[PDB]
Amino acid sequence: RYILKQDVPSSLEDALKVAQAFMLSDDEIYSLRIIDLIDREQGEDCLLLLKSLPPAEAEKTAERVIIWARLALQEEPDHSKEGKAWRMSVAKTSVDILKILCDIQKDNLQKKDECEEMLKLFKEVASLQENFEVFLSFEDYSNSSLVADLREQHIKAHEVAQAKHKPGSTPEPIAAEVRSPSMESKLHRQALALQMSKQELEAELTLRALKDGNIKTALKKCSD
Amino acid sequence: LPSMQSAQGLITQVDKLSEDIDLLKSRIESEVRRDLHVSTGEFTDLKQQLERDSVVLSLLKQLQEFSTAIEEYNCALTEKKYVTGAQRLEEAQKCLKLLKSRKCFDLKILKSLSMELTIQKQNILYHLGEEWQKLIVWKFPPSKDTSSLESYLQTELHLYTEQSHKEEKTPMPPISSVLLAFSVLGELHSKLKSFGQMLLKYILRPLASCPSLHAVIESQPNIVIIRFESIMTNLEYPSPSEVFTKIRLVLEVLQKQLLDLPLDTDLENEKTSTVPLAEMLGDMIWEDLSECLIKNCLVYSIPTNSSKLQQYEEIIQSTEEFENALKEMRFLKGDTTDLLK
Amino acid sequence: TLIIQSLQRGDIQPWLHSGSNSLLSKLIHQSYHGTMDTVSLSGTIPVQMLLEIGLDKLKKDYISFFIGQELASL
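Predict the joint structure of the above. Result:
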């Protein structure tokens, strides 16, 4: 740890032989190097180091750093800008190393399903963090109540994003020959993590409009 | 480098300083009750500072305990005493939560404490994950296929029963200790999720799809082998009674060979209770097993002629015992499930 | 205390002479063998540790003259 704190270009090599001659695994060396680079938000260096490493020790370093990342994300969220930036960087650096580990473990069937499930969980966490700036713990993440609440919130948001666009008054001199991005595309950006297709969105909108007493908008969508 | 003996020096000096704080507080309290009208204010004014120093000293005690628990856990790692190391880590976590609950230290110091705690926690968890895979072995065919008969034929499950005292120079702790270590740190929930799903995918679901599959359990003293051996049958869909018997045959061994070990929570905390292993294992597989049995076995057992209705009675009976056994083996919580309704 | 800090940090290797009647030389020797216990300074102990050095210094200064001038033997 002291050698790795010197920021010497050969400090990684200096610390390698310390654990080599004293009969300690190289797993800890590269794991701590990757952790130090993650704390410095330098995940590209982690990627190049992982690609330079042989796959055998690469698996060991990757699984340990993934466990460390989930454990570090399990504590209380930080409401400062630097804290949330660190959570986002950790998730983004974890997703692609999980992809690499999935590529490595194609034949290890016992490890294959575990890695695919863990990759899916971190993909959902990172997608929810980046597209929403919502940071909690994994116990709060896996709880389906928050997922359903955020699904219905953005269903209602899509309701208004079109309801305001049916003209209740004269149009404004906005989006004149330079049209703004569609609200449906942003909702779909959000829902790619929510795994909601167009058919389910239309089904929910039909029921929501029916509850509002609007008959024509539900019938037209059913006919389409 | 030059502070290993200074750690014991710190222990001694903090102990004698706590003793000094206590004796001076006793001296102050002895004289406060004597002069309660003339000496109260100036005694209390200095007792406030004494109590603040005592609070800071208690925080330093918590830091010393944080260091000592980590060092004892490091010592326990080398000797493969994972349960005590996990308990020491839990004590350190409890100390760190109280350290972070009071805003009195530098933020970077607490950041370093938390970083080292997480490093040691991932260190013990990775060792537990390593040691999990030696005891339980899944031997797969060289493909992801689960539709061909050879896919089920080349599937093997191995449980390394430690019947005799291990003489290997690379020893393996007993499965009960592994389960205790996972329960102390609260990570048994994810491991059960990982294992029950592969059990469902490669053991449970196959038995409800192909009527020709038969589960053979070879019981060696050290290695228990679960194997699929193909015996040809003439039924287009598996009948309920044989499928229930085959499921019960595997579930008895799985409960007795693996799930028959007591659990224990943190040593210093008795506010947490131990949940039986069979309950948690069933809760994560029973929902997907009842629907698999209904949609693959009980649907096709329904007769097409009214004359064959009475012969269905055994299926009503044979299900109930399959419902009862899992209730005796604690794989279920209630009495009426969707498999019987 | 400064001597204790210097010995613990392993920054110097003090030059020593034979006889080593002073306890400080023994402290240096034990620092040569790794790390030593924390030395306490209470009462007249600090006076005596310094006193034990002057005796050896004066004895060596005397012996360098008695034997050096062939006026006395050991």
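Chain B touches chain A at residues 114-115, 118-119, 121-123, 125-126, 129, 133, 138, 140, 142, 144, 194, 197-198, 201 (CB under 8 Å).
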